[PDB]
Amino acid sequence: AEFLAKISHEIRTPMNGVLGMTELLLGTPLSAKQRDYVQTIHSAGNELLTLINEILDISKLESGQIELDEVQFDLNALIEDCLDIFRVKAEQQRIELISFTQPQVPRVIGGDPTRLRQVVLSLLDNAFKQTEEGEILLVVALDDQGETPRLRIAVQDSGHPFDAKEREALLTAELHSGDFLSASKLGSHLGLIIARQLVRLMGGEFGIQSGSTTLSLTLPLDPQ
Amino acid sequence: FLAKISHEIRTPMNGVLGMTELLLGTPLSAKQRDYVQTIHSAGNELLTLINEILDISKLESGQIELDEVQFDLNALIEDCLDIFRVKAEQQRIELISFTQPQVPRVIGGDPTRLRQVVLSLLDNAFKQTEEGEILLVVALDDQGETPRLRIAVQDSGHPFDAKEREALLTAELHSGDFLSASKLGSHLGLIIARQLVRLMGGEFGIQSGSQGTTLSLTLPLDPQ
Numbered sequence A: 001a002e003f004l005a006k007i008s009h010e011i012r013t014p015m016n017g018v019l020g021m022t023e024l025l026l027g028t029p030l031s032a033k034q035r036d037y038v039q040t041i042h043s044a045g046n047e048l049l050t051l052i053n054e055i056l057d058i059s060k061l062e063s064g065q066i067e068l069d070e071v072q073f074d075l076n077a078l079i080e081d082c083l084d085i086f087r088v089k090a091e092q093q094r095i096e097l098i099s100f101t102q103p104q105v106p107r108v109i110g111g112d113p114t115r116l117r118q119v120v121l122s123l124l125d126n127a128f129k130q131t132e133e134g135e136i137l138l139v140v141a142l143d144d145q146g147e148t149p150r151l152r153i154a155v156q157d158s159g160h161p162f163d164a165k166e167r168e169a170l171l172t173a174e175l176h177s178g179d180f181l182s183a184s185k186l187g188s189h190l191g192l193i194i195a196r197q198l199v200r201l202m203g204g205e206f207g208i209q210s211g212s213t214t215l216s217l218t219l220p221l222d223p224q
Numbered sequence B: 001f002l003a004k005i006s007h008e009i010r011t012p013m014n015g016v017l018g019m020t021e022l023l024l025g026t027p028l029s030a031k032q033r034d035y036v037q038t039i040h041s042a043g044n045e046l047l048t049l050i051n052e053i054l055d056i057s058k059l060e061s062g063q064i065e066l067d068e069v070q071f072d073l074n075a076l077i078e079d080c081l082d083i084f085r086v087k088a089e090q091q092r093i094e095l096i097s098f099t100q101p102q103v104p105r106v107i108g109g110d111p112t113r114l115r116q117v118v119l120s121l122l123d124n125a126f127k128q129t130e131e132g133e134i135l136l137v138v139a140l141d142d143q144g145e146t147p148r149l150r151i152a153v154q155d156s157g158h159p160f161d162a163k164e165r166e167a168l169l170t171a172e173l174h175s176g177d178f179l180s181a182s183k184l185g186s187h188l189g190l191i192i193a194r195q196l197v198r199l200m201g202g203e204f205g206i207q208s209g210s211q212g213t214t215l216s217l218t219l220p221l222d223p224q
């Protein structure tokens, strides 16, 4: 996990130029059809750059190069924010965003918001690509089961929930430098897997119960 | 190239390069042209790098197996040189090739990788030499206990250092140390080229005369 982080500059350096010219190109006199192409380089280039950025920092985390910072953040305000990106396209029918935050759960807890923001988004975004019609509910509750209260977050999948082989391969997902690029055909897109690894790093477990899927994450916490 | 870059890196970058090849068909100013010209000449660099990084990790891990089929040796070596002739005509370079009288027409092996290794060395020449002559000698080597094939590519080019020579022969990934970040970007395909030959069955070494650098592999020629 040192490697990708060690040579991070040279994976960044040309990509910084691709968007560098692009966010610069918009200022030039662009014709009607030209600007349609240049912004495509902007729009598609970023979603690859963020992917690149998203795989390097997780590569840094498994090495122990950097730490997940512990701060006290508004748990509900983050979740309701996570919904608001998807609520704008929730007006299209045959899907319904539902949020249930059990009254017992705290409003603020100690953890890392940004990396939790990804995992909640990555679990939520997967539900949209899965469901053609239906409704998606996100529960934020704590399961008192266990020696010490632990927080749980789950998202319910609409269709073809999981391959029996496919899920097991998700639970035992550990990716190295080259492994993050190999395009394993088994199929959990990069987005899902990176998301999975973090939820192991912060403690707790990942759970998917496929019933004809509820991508569940159970972070820990100390009772205070 | 024998490693499939991810479904989520290849296709966004596929759209970026698709624009640059398409955008030049549109009238644009000179200063505007360089911006799109680099994205083609730089967006490829990252895509070439991600593949190269991935290729080593697959060679070391052993997930790569070689075909055993009969191919025409002359065509392959003749076909590789046809690629570079257009790149060699502009560059003031005369590339020449000699194939010994004794080396056979057909040998059993893997023609797809052997092309890549021959492509790998042959590219390195043009990368590090101008004004010079590039030569490709194909000749069997009888010094071993049994006749073996060996292919030599040398350039009237600038030599390799004492440490870059040592690095190309010893450095490995998911191992001790890769020794560089800046220096590998150009010479990474040569390590890959070594990985095949070392797997192919014979040793691949480099002897740098202080000017011409000869990169020669020895492949185990078929029994009879």
Ligand code: NI
Pocket: A006, A007, A008, A009, A010, B181
């Ligand atoms: Ni650096």
Ligand code: NI
Pocket: A023
């Ligand atoms: Ni922007």
Ligand code: NI
Pocket: A160, A162, A163
């Ligand atoms: Ni399926």
Ligand code: NI
Pocket: A189, B007
């Ligand atoms: Ni896809």
Ligand code: NI
Pocket: B040
């Ligand atoms: Ni091209």
Ligand code: NI
Pocket: A001, A176, B174, B175
């Ligand atoms: Ni390793």
